[PDB]
Structure formats: structure tokens, C-alpha cells
Amino acid sequence: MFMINILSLIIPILLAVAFLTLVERKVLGYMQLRKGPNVVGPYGLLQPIADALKLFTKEPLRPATSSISMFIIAPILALSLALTMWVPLPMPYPLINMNLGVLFMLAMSSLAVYSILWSGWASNSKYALIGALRAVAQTISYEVTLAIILLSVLLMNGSYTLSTLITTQEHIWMIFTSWPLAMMWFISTLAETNRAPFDLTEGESELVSGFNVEYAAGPFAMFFMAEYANIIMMNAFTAILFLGASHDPHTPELYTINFVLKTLALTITFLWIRASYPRFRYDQLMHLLWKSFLPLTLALCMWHISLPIMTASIPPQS
Amino acid sequence: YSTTRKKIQEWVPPSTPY
Amino acid sequence: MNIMLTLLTNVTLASLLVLIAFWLPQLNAYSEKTSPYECGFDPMGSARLPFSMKFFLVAITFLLFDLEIALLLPLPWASQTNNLKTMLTMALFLLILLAASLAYEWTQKGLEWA
Amino acid sequence: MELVQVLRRGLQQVSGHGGLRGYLRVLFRANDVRVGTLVGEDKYGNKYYEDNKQFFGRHRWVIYTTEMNGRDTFWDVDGSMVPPEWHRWLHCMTDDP
Amino acid sequence: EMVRKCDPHIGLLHRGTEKLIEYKTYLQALPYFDRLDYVSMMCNEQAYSLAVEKLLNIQPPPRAQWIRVLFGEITRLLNHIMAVTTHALDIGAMTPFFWMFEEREKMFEFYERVSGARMHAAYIRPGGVHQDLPLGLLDDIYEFSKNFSFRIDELEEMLTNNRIWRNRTVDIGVVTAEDALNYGFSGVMLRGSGIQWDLRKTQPYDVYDQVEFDVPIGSRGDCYDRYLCRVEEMRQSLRIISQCLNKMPPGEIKVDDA
Amino acid sequence: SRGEYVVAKLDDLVNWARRSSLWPMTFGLACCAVEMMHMAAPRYDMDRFGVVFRASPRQSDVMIVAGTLTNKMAPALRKVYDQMPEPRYVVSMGSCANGGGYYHYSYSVVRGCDRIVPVDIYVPGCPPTAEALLYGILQLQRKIKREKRLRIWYRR
Amino acid sequence: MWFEILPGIAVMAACLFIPGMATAHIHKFTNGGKEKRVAHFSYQWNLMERDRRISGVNRYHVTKGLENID
Amino acid sequence: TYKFVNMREPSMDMKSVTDRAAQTLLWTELVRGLGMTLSYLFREPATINYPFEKGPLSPRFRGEHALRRYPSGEERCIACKLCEAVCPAQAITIEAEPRADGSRRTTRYDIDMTKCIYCGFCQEACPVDAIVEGPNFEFSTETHEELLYNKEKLLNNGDKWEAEIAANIQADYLYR
Ligand SMILES: CCCCCCCCCCCCCCCCC[C@@H](O)O[C@H](CO[C@H](O)CCCCCCCCCCCCCCC)COP(=O)(O)OCC[N+](C)(C)C
Ligand code: SF4
Ligand code: SF4
Ligand code: SF4
């Protein structure tokens, strides 16, 4: 019956990305004073399914110039990995007890953007190619610092296994120990997921919906959907990794009741970022990283390498 | 629709022969 | 097994969404509708060569840092070795060179990114 | 003082009478004077904004085809002549005839 | 990804105006001007009505001049709102937009109120002004104007310090102060490069003789300075509104010359 | 459980679907661009009706044609109209492009917007008040709601 | 007003709430309340190796106690 | 008069230096603006509930046209035809012929909203104050041919709204 467990992991999350869309227009609406979607609800609630139906019902043309195979395979990979990254996530009990699933989170995250590269390559359009390319730039440029700071915050939990990361937070929370790395992790999740100030992949006014343009109905729904999969997912990831909680094994549910709060509390923040800052432009986007984030990530890294020895505080896990 | 009736009201040949 | 099963159910799920995406609206594709988008007016030419040294000049540096972090990964486990003084220098050492490499780029004006 | 507010939600819940329908169509809620006239039904209000004052409510039987909760009400449905002048603040001080 | 030369091609909206104007009498030509710089609909009308009154050798009764300057200024605020805002929207700020178009809508409530149209208010006349404005208006303008400044200020808190916004626009795109003059740049594009010039102070045309306000010179000539000029000129117009409200003489508004 | 009954149900479902969240793209060519924006301004908020301006026709359906059209411009317009997915619509707006309107007699205008694309609803104005526009699009939904390809397809 | 956001957000929570519960109980449902067993290392698997065979039933959920020796 | 925006420059005082450095590292103004939008979340939304509520307008507002009658029930229009003669879009077309009684009247007054620019010159021009730019502002329609109003259509608009229009003109004319 493991299969029904998996299905039980995949349906609720898709429902969550739909209602995530709706919340996005809501909050992001009230920042603007204007109310968000409302009339169709009554509280808007029925909207996202009407939305998705509007999409899938609508004709999804196969472009004349595009090669078709890449053009179809890319969205598939997008939702694929967007969902697959969810499996080893301790809530509290992981669906899979990977010995080193964090590293796996990095693996999925790193194959993610490759789909963007195909998405813009097979699309054949000028905007497609240029936007896709700059997209891959910002992405990788952030995955390096990404993985380093994640390393440095992992020296002290003990090991790459995720469940232990609960155990190592049975009191103080990791964040008080190494918040600056939490900042850089936050922003790196704010760019790797391609979000608000780090907005370039969509391009928007800069490049009229970026790479995603030539995709029409359903595949567009897939990239859109998968994008929100990554946003909520890196949010949850940050939540478990920098914000611990009380956990009685006899009542696991209690913990989850807490956890969705602590993660939702993050996701909303991205939206409340979106309502706040103009995008960086491709120079500065990479400037602040290579010039400014990174060296601190290193100095902090040696520092965190060095605390366990000076403090004689080396974490247990073999 | 068209308003203000007609224009030239051109005459037509009589029914009677010759 | 376990993981292969979830991979299969995910991919089959997505592929199912694709098939219900195409074989459903059931309407009329035709030429010019299917022509590539170019903000209205037709393209002056199919995509060619957006060449830039400023791509690889940094992207290669990405690749040579990523190889480095690949060596950083063993660290959490190496931390529990019986003889840290033998280790610790190296734990610092690579990071210095990582930084050093960057530093060398920092000021030969090889890092113009963009 | 959240309790007084939720209590206001309650008093509104009772006074509206089956508010679920009004929120199923007219999208809620608070109502007011309930002055009326027009070809059918209609309504009125007064509250606390220069824009939120003077609401309206479509006739359930409408001008002809039935218009009600979960039905396609017209914007041109509002009574001709007199009521918009009070309804656009052309003369909200001048109550509807 | 660098540009090598941008090559603008205007005329994509050449509706062909000047040919049309020639066939229509003066009073019938006036609306075209709203249809011109449509964001700044009043000042165009004022430009025209001056352009005729000089030929016609005729002078508006003073109250009309006070309206003409007053709405000249509310319109000053309209264009600056639209400018700073949509310029922000182009670089993705998104939000300030919605915070301001509430206000801009409240200003259109005024064009709505006096002219009967939300915009394109063919209201300024070669002879002076059309209908007199309704009694209930000036307090209403007062009540708004007193509270607008918090709004512009809060905008400024989201922008002027927002160093992301700074970095995006601070070293671009500078123009040499003389080189501006060779190209005949006008208004803010001049002041950004620090040259003193400004027509309201220089060759005043109306009651600008009788209003007092501070023109904000820029310095570096970067977009950022131009932005601060936009904002500060908004505040200054907001100064003008005070004075015009405080000295708004009774009298006729159209010229006596029937 | 008549087949026609089920067809009435699916008819209601897809037509309600498409009508419930259409996604305009906009040629705010001339000066009726700004009034379009006041529809999206907080005070009227097009978004609460679900409609949301999203650029790039391929991700959009209904098209607003605010503001005066001109000769050089027209071919681009036809291009953009062709690149939209079915079921595409359009909306002529203002006295602008209903038929040249003010500029009816010039060499560069292309009279109506009608003469290059198959318009749906008209929204007369100059500029139309944004609210009259709002009545426009709601009227558009009350026209989609009468669409019924499914009922007809079964019938044929 | 802003509180009206809540119906939109609570629906989020419950959805996300579901997997976290749904897995945690399925474990207990399958394992007989034993709350699953991790086996990161060869040795722990060796304990599940010694198990299952020890229970007459192959399902190792049950842990025969002292009574097993007599 | 002339004012220097900017030109003001930062102090090099060490307290100030540490302040700007801490500002850069810890993002003070960033969190300031972020706190600002937090603050706008709590204000009451500005939206009106259209259709169910409708925006404020003015007595002077311009919209759908409509010829209108004397209280006697007689129509006002007398074909002085200068409505044709003053409309910049020249939307109007008129073709008068004598009444059998001998009074001046139109035969096919017509207008087309397709070309009309709603400037309200006609509203001003009429000596007998016949044509009036009515308060109604909504009449968006499916088909182009409907826009091109006939005389009868205008009269019907004048019938639909007459109390309303007479109310506006009653409230407005003194300013004219
Ligand atoms: C025992 C001692 C151990 C260490 C103790 C000292 C700790 C070290 C100091 C801590 C610093 C860590 C902060 C992270 C790096 C900050 C650098 C970053 O800001 O770079 C700047 C770039 O800034 C960033 O890009 C900001 C954009 C990020 C947008 C998201 C906003 C985040 C909102 C706040 C969320 C906080 C949540 C977590 C709080 C706990 C580039 O600077 P510059 O080029 O010179 O000019 C721009 C200056 N700015 C900052 C005003 C813009
Ligand atoms: S409608 Fe009024 S504004 Fe829009 S184009 Fe025609 S004239 Fe200019
Ligand atoms: S003015 Fe009014 S009434 Fe006199 S002619 Fe022109 S339209 Fe007929
Ligand atoms: S509406 Fe304005 S433009 Fe159209 S006819 Fe009457 S006056 Fe001339």
C-alpha cells in the first residue's frame, strides 16, 4: 500500500500549488489595496480550478518552427522533478529515509533548470533563446553559493540525513546559531526559485514572459505549476532546516500542525517580497553574488568548519 | 436602417399597348 | 522497490497531463497561427549566434568552483576522524585556494560577468 | 476587542437572513436602510465610505428572464431614470423617489 | 546582450493631426490637443488658448487665469505620477503603481466634476475657460491636497532609499549639460544636468508672477536625478495649490468679448 | 441521465470556465491605454473579476484594442491576432477604433478596428469611462455564457 | 478586509497538512503501532534481518517478548 | 528658487560610517520598505463592488445622446442643423423637411457613436436645448450597425431617461 502513500503525497501538493496561486493573487492583491480575486468564489476559492480548466480546455498549438520532441519533453521534466524533490522530506516522518537526501535535494534542484534551457532552446524564438540563456546564468551562479552555505550549515547537525536534523534542533533552533547563512540561504532560495527581485527568467516587461512564451496552454500550465512546486518546496526545506520544533513521537501529527505553519510563514513572505522590490538586472544580479555574497559564504564557511574543533562540539552522527 | 423615403421616383411605361 | 516506483508514478502522471493537454481541445491549427512569436512583426531571421566571451569567462569559473565544492562535501564526515590536526589544515586549505582562485579572478578583471 | 467584531459578524448573520444566498450572488454583506422602489425589488444602503455608500440589489425575477443567486444579473438591470441619480452620488443627498 | 545601436521608428501611431486641423475652425480644433499628450491633457489646452489669445490680442479675466494655473498644476501632478510610476513598473516595482492610481483616480474625480468628462476635458477655451466650476469643489480639493503628501512621501520611502532601485538607475544615462542644449532637450531633461533654465520662472505666462515655488535642479544628469526632480516638482506643485486656493478672486471666467 | 442532460452540464462547465477567468492582452495604442489601466486600478480592480493582464498572446485570449489604430501599425495587429490560441476574442474600445472615431478622415488611420480583425463586443466612449468598459467585459461574459459548441456538436 | 484572505490560506494549510499526517499514520497502520524503523546502516538492517525470521509471522512488526524463550 | 536635490553628501564620521556599513550588511531601508507594504496590507481596500455599487459621477457628466420632448409631449428639435455644423467629428447628419403643419422638423436625424467623440459641443450648441448628452454611460453593444443611432433611437433614449436628464439640467444650468 506504499503506492497509495505516494498518491497521498502527490495529490494534496498539486492542490496546494493551485491554492497557492490563489493566495498569491490574494495577498499580493491586498498589498496593492485592491482586493484580489473574489467574485467567483464566494471568497475566490473556486477560482484556481476554473483557471486550470480554462487552460487545459484552451488549444495548445504545436509551433511550426519548434522541434517537437524537446518542446514536449521539457514540461514533463519540470513537473517531474518538481514533485520528485518532495519525497525525502521529513514531515515528521520522511516518505523515504535517504541516508543523504539533502544532497539529493540539491541534485533535483540542479537538474531543474536544465529544463529551462531546453524550454528556451526548442522554443526557437529570439526571446526564448536570450531569456533562457540569461536564466541559466543566474541559476547556476546561485547554485554554487547555494550548495556551499548549505554545507556549512550542515557541518553541525552531524550528517546529511534529514530526520537527524530534527534531533539536532530539539531546543535552540539552528537559526540563532548561524543566521547570516540563513540569510544567504534565504536569498539563494529567492533566486534559484526565480522569484521577486531576482525575476529574470520570466523576464516580464523586460522580455515579455521570457522563456515561457511560446508554450501555450497545458505545457505552460506545467511550467507555471512546477514553478510553484519549487517555491513551496524550498520554503518547506528552509523551514525544517532552520527552524526546529518540539516533537513527541506518540503524537507526530502535532508536529506537522506546527510545521505547515512555520513553512507557510515563509512562503507568504516571498509574496510580500514580490510586492516590494524592483528587479535587479542581469549584471547586478550576478555582481552581488560573485562579488559580495560569496566571500562571506567562504569566511563563514571556514568559521563553521572551525567552531566544532575549538568548541570541542563535534556532532554525533557517524 | 435607411430613413427619409426614396429619391427620383422614376416613371415607368404604361400597361396599355401603343 | 521504493524510489523507482515514485519516479514512475510521477513521470506517468506528468505524461498523462500532457496527453490530456493535446488530445482534448480538438480544434484547428493552421499556418501563421503556428508561426513563431516576435512581438507582432515577423522575425528577421531564425536564432543564430548570441556570442559572448562574457558567458564562458565566468561560467567556466562556475564549473571550476563546482568541482571544488565536490571536494568540500566529504567534510562533515571527515570531521569525526581521529586526528583533526592532520585534517584541519586541509579543511582550511582548499577553502583558501577556492578564495584564492576567486581572488585571482577578482582583480585581473576577468570577472566582468554580465 | 475581536469578540465585539465577531459578534458583529453574528448580528450581521442574523439580520441579513440567509446571508449565504446574498454572498452566493451579491457578495456580502452588512446591508443598511433597505429603501426600495423601481420596476422590481431593488434596494438601498448607507454606511461609511464615499464609494461604499448606496448599494443595490437585482430583482430576483428581474425584468423578464429570472435573475437571482447564481444567475447572470445585468448591470443595465438597474431601474432607468430616477435611481442612478441617487446611486451615482449625482444627488445621493436627494433620496430616490 | 549589449545593444550596439537602438534605432527608433516612430510614426507607428501617426494619426495624422496637422492635416486635419487645417480643415476645422479654431474652436473645433481644440480637442485634438487633449488627444496629443494625453497624460497631460490640460496643459496642452492651455498652450493653445495662449497661442490664440496672443493672435487675438485678448486677455482672460483673472479668475480664469487662476483656474488655468490650478488645473495646470493638478495636471502637473498627473503627469508626474504617471511618469514616476510607470517608469517604476517598467523596472518591475509593480506596487507603487496601485498606491498612486487611487489618487490619480481621485483627481479624475475632479476633471469629472467640473468638465463632465473623466479626462480629455475640453474645458480650457481660447477665450479663457468653459463653464464655471461648481461651488462644492474647492474644499474638496483642499481636503485631498492636505493628505496627498503622506502618499507621495510613502512612495518616496519605497523608492529613493531602496538601494536596489538606486543601483539600477544612478549611473545612467548621463547627458552633457551643453550637449542637452544642442539637442534642445527641454524641461526636466535639462535640469537633470544642472542648467538653471525653466519657463515658469523665466518667461512666465500667467499668475506664475504671483505664485512662489522652488524649482529643483538636478546634478549628475543620471535618471536618478531626473526622478528626484519629478518628485520634488510634485511637491512644489503641491505648494502652488495652496497659494491658488488662498487667492482665488470672484469675477467672470469667460472673456466679456462676445 | 439523458446524454443531452450531461451535455448541458459539460456545456455549463467549460463555458463557465472560459468565461470565469479570461486573460486579456492589450494594445493600449493611443490614449485609451490609460483608462484601461484604471480598470486595473485598485478602485475598480479588474483582477477581482479574475481577468489579469498578461503579455504574450500565447498565454492570453481576449484582446483589448484601446486607442487609435494607424496604417503602419495594422499588420502587426493582424500578426498578433493570428498568433493567439483558440478560442480567441477581441474587444474594440472607445470611439477610437470602432471606426476611426475622431480621426475618421486621415490617410494613416484604418477606420474601424473591424477591418482587420473579427471584433466581439464594442465599448463606445472617448475614452470610455473605465467603468463603462467594465460593463463591457461583463457583457462579454454574458456572451460567452451563451456559447454552446458542445450542445451544437452533439446535435450535428 | 484582510482577514478575508484567510479562507484562501487555510485551504493551503489543510492540503499541506494531509501528507504529513497521511504518511505518519500509514506507518503505524502497517507496522502495528511500531512507528516504522529506519535502517541507515548495515547493522540495523541486520537487526531486521534477525527479526522477521524470529517472529513466526514474517512481518517483523510483532516483537516476541520473554515468553518466547518458554 | 532653484533647489538642489541630492548634492548633499554623507559624513565620514566613524559612527556614521559604521551606520552605513551596518545598513548595507543588514538592509535597514530594505526592511523599511518591506514594513511599509506590510502597513498597506492593513488599510481598508479601495474597491467598489461594481455592478452592485457604482462609482461617483457629476451632474455635468457626458454620455449617451438623446433628443427629448417638451412637457407638452411635442419634440424639441427644430433642425437648425448647427449640431451638424459644430461637431468636430461631424458624426451628426441631418435632413429636415417641413411638417404638414408647416413647422420645421427633421426627417432623419442620425448620429453614430462610432465617430462621435463625446466632446459635448452638441450639448452646448442647441438653441432650443434639444439634443442632450445623457447621464447614461453604458450601452456597449455586440454589433457595429447598432452604434449608428437613428432618430427614433435617440427619442427612445430621451423617453427612457427624461426625469433623470431633466434632473441633471435642473441641477446644472445655472452654471451655464
Ligand atoms: C563571532 C563572529 C562571527 C560573525 C559575526 C558577524 C556577522 C557577519 C556580518 C553579517 C552580514 C550577512 C548579511 C548577508 C550579506 C549582505 C550583503 C548584501 O546585502 O549585498 C548587497 C546587496 O543587497 C542584497 O542584494 C539585498 C537584496 C535582497 C532582497 C530580499 C530582502 C530581504 C528582506 C529581509 C528578510 C530577512 C529574513 C531573515 C532575518 C532573520 C550588496 O551591497 P552593495 O553592492 O555594496 O550595495 C547594496 C547595499 N544594499 C544592501 C543596501 C542593497
Ligand atoms: S477615444 Fe478619445 S482618446 Fe481614445 S483615441 Fe479615440 S479620441 Fe483619443
Ligand atoms: S440644435 Fe439640437 S435641435 Fe437645433 S438643430 Fe441641431 S439638433 Fe436639431
Ligand atoms: S458628441 Fe461631442 S462630438 Fe459627438 S457630436 Fe455631440 S458634440 Fe460633436
Reading the block at residue E242, the C-alpha cell is: 495652496
Pairwise CA distance, residues E107 & E74, whole Å = 8
Does A39 contact F at CB distance below 8 Å?
Answer: yes
Reading the block at residue H144, the C-alpha cell is: 457595429
Pairwise CA distance, residues A39 & H53, whole Å = 14
Size of chain E in residues: 258
- Name every chain H residue with its beta carbon within 8 A of the beta carbon of F46: none
Nearest to A48 by CA among A22, A30, A29: A22
DSSP string, chain F: --HHHHHHHHHHHHHHHHHHS---EE---STTHHHHHHHHSTTT-GGGGT----SSGGG---EEE-S---TTTHHHHHHHHHHSPSS---EEETTTTTS-GGGTT-SS--S-GGGTS----EE--SSPPHHHHHHHHHHHHHHHTT--HHHHHHH-
Other C-beta atoms lying within 10 Å of the C-beta of residue E209: 9
The burial class, CB within 10 Å (0-12 / 13-18 / 19+), for A157 is buried
Pairwise CA distance, residues A248 & C51, whole Å = 58
CB A253 within 8 A of CB G21: yes
* Measured CA distances, D40 to D36, D78, D80, F82, F141 (Å): 9, 9, 12, 46, 24
Q: List the alpha helices (DSSP H) in chain C.
A: 3-22, 53-72, 75-78, 84-107
Pairwise CA distance, residues A54 & C25, whole Å = 11
CB E111 within 8 A of CB E119: yes
CA A304 to chain centroid, in Å, comes to 25
Chains A & G: contacts with CB separation below 8 Å: 100
Pairwise CA distance, residues C33 & H80, whole Å = 53
- Per DSSP, C42 falls in state P
Q: Which residue lies with its CA nearest to atom 26 of ligand 1?
A: H27
CB contact under 8 A, G1 and H45: yes
CB D67 within 8 A of CB D73: yes
CB A209 within 8 A of CB F54: yes
Q: How far does A54 lie from chain D, in Å, by closest CA?
A: 19
C neighbours by CB contacts (3+ pairs under 8 Å): A, E, F
* Measured CA distances, A96 to A2, C76, F23, F151, H89 (Å): 11, 22, 41, 49, 74
Which residues are bridge partners to F91 per DSSP?
F64
CB E121 within 8 A of CB E133: no
Pairwise CA distance, residues H140 & A161, whole Å = 64
Please enumerate, as own/partner, the contacts of C12-18 that have beta carbons within 8 Å and a separation of 24 or more.
C13/A10, C13/A79, C13/A83, C14/A75, C14/A76, C14/A79, C14/A80, C14/A83, C14/A222, C15/A76, C17/A79, C17/A218, C17/A222, C18/A72, C18/A75, C18/A76, C18/A218, C18/A219, C18/A222
H171 lines ligand 3 (CB under 6 A): no
Chains A & E: contacts with CB separation below 8 Å: 44
Sheet with F25-26, strands from edge to edge, namely F25-26, F63-65, F91-93, F122-123
* Measured CA distances, H54 to A91, A300, D68, F139, H122 (Å): 49, 59, 19, 16, 27
Reading the block at residue E196, the C-alpha cell is: 538653471
- Name every chain D residue with its beta carbon within 8 A of the beta carbon of H135: 84-85, 88, 90
Chains A and F are in contact, defined as 3 or more C-beta pairs closer than 8 angstroms: yes
Q: Is E120 annotated as a binding residue?
A: yes
H126 lines ligand 3 (CB under 6 A): yes
Nearest to A80 by CA among C17, C2, G19: C17
Q: Which residue lies with its CA nearest to atom 6 of ligand 2?
A: F96
Pairwise CA distance, residues E247 & E208, whole Å = 13
Strands E216-217 and F25-26: unpaired
Pairwise CA distance, residues G38 & G21, whole Å = 18
Q: How far does F150 lie from chain D, in Å, by closest CA?
A: 20
CB E184 within 8 A of CB E166: no
- Name every chain H residue with its beta carbon within 8 A of the beta carbon of D51: 46, 48, 53, 55-56
Pairwise CA distance, residues E244 & E74, whole Å = 11
CA C26 to chain centroid, in Å, comes to 37
Task: State the first-to-last Cα distance of chain B, in angstroms, to the nearest integer.
Answer: 41
Q: List the alpha helices (DSSP H) in D1-97.
A: 2-15, 19-25, 82-87
Cis-peptide, bond into residue A60, ω within 30° of zero: no
Closest in H115, H137, H143 to F95, CB measured? H115
A307 lines ligand 1 (CB under 6 A): no
Chains H and F are in contact, defined as 3 or more C-beta pairs closer than 8 angstroms: yes
Reading the block at residue A245, the C-alpha cell is: 520544533
CB F36 within 8 A of CB F26: yes
Closest in A34, A35, A272 to H37, CB measured? A272
Compute the CA torsion angle D36, D37, D40, D41 (nearest 10 deg): 10
Pairwise CA distance, residues F96 & F108, whole Å = 14
Pairwise CA distance, residues F23 & A52, whole Å = 12
Atom of ligand 3 nearest to the CA of H82: 6
H62 lines ligand 4 (CB under 6 A): no
Mutation target for A interface from D27, D29, D52, D71: give the one with most A CBs within 10 A: D27
CB contact under 8 A, E217 and H5: yes
CB contact under 8 A, A163 and G24: no
Reading the block at residue F154, the C-alpha cell is: 452533439
H89 lines ligand 4 (CB under 6 A): yes
Does H128 contact D at CB distance below 8 Å?
Answer: no
Mutation target for H interface from B1, B4, B5: give the one with most H CBs within 10 A: B4
CB E61 within 8 A of CB E252: yes
Chains A and E are in contact, defined as 3 or more C-beta pairs closer than 8 angstroms: yes
Q: How far does H131 lie from chain A, in Å, by closest CA?
A: 39
CB contact under 8 A, F77 and C40: yes
Amino acid at A162: L
Reading the block at residue H77, the C-alpha cell is: 428639435
CB H79 within 8 A of CB H94: yes
A294 lines ligand 1 (CB under 6 A): no
Chains H and C are in contact, defined as 3 or more C-beta pairs closer than 8 angstroms: no
Domain boundaries, chain G: 1-70
Nearest to F61 by CA among F94, F32, F26: F26
CB A27 within 8 A of CB A184: no
CB contact under 8 A, H88 and E31: yes
Method: cryo-EM
Pairwise CA distance, residues H44 & F131, whole Å = 21
Pairwise CA distance, residues A24 & A28, whole Å = 6
Pairwise CA distance, residues A132 & A135, whole Å = 5
CA dihedral sign, ordered E182, E183, E186, E190: negative
Roughly what angle, to the nearest 10 degrees, separates helices A114-121 and A68-84? 160
Nearest to E76 by CA among E127, E132, E130, E148: E148
Which residues are bridge partners to F26 per DSSP?
F64
Compute the CA torsion angle C1, C2, C5, C10 (nearest 10 deg): -170
Nearest to F47 by CA among G5, H52, A20, A36: A36
Q: Which residue lies with its CA nearest to atom 4 of ligand 4?
A: H116
Helix (H) or strand (E) holding E217: strand E216-217
- Name every chain D residue with its beta carbon within 8 A of the beta carbon of F139: 75
Please enumerate, as own/partner, the contacts of F71-77 that have beta carbons within 8 Å and a separation of 24 or more.
F71/F107, F71/F108, F71/F109, F71/F110, F72/E11, F72/E12, F72/E14, F72/F108, F73/E12, F73/E13, F73/F29, F74/F110, F74/F116, F75/C40, F75/C41, F76/C40, F76/C41, F77/C40, F77/F27, F77/F116, F77/F117
Backbone angles phi, psi at E186, to 5 degrees: -135, 155
Location of C-alpha cell 473623466: E118
Comparing alpha-carbon positions, the chain H residue that sits nearest to E106 is H56
3-class DSSP state of E250: coil
Question: Residue F29 C-alpha to ligand 2 middle, in angstroms?
Answer: 10
Nearest to A144 by CA among C63, C104, C107: C63
Pairwise CA distance, residues A128 & E176, whole Å = 37
Q: How far does F67 lie from chain C, in Å, by closest CA?
A: 17
Chains B & H: contacts with CB separation below 8 Å: 10
Comparing alpha-carbon positions, the chain C residue that sits nearest to F82 is C33
B neighbours by CB contacts (3+ pairs under 8 Å): H
CA angle, A143 then A148 then A150, to 5°: 90
Query: Which residues, 6 or more positions from E121, have their beta carbon under 8 angstroms from its beta carbon?
Result: E34, E41, E42, E45, E111, E114, E115
3-state secondary structure chain H: CCEECCCCCCCCCHHHHHHHHHHHHHCHHHHHHHHHHHHHHCCCCCCCCCCCCCCCCCCCCCCCECCCECCCCCECCCCCCHHHHHCCCCCCECCECCCCCCCCCECCCECCCCCCCCCCHHHHHCCCCCCCECCCCCCCECCHHHHCCCHHHHHHHHHHCHHHHHHHHHHHHHHC
A180 lines ligand 1 (CB under 6 A): yes
For residue A108, the number of C-alpha atoms closer than 13 Å in the C-beta half-sphere is 23
Which residues are bridge partners to A180 per DSSP?
none
Given in angstroms, what resolution was this structure solved at?
4.0
Domains of chain C: 1-108 (1.20.58.1610)
- Name every chain F residue with its beta carbon within 8 A of the beta carbon of C20: none
CA A305 to chain centroid, in Å, comes to 27
Pairwise CA distance, residues A174 & D82, whole Å = 68
H120 lines ligand 4 (CB under 6 A): yes
Q: List the alpha helices (DSSP H) in chain E.
A: 18-22, 26-34, 41-56, 62-90, 95-115, 137-159, 163-168, 177-183, 188-191, 199-202, 223-246
Amino acid at F12: D
Amino acid at G66: L
Pairwise CA distance, residues F94 & F128, whole Å = 5
- Name every chain H residue with its beta carbon within 8 A of the beta carbon of A30: 41, 45
Pairwise CA distance, residues E174 & E225, whole Å = 10
* Measured CA distances, H47 to B7, D32, D50, E98, F137 (Å): 56, 19, 12, 12, 17
Does A276 contact H at CB distance below 8 Å?
Answer: yes
Helix (H) or strand (E) holding E216: strand E216-217
Pairwise CA distance, residues F58 & A62, whole Å = 11
3-class DSSP state of A116: helix
CB F106 within 8 A of CB E16: yes
Closest in H48, H52, H135 to D51, CB measured? H48
Does A187 contact G at CB distance below 8 Å?
Answer: no
Nearest to A24 by CA among A48, A59, A50: A48
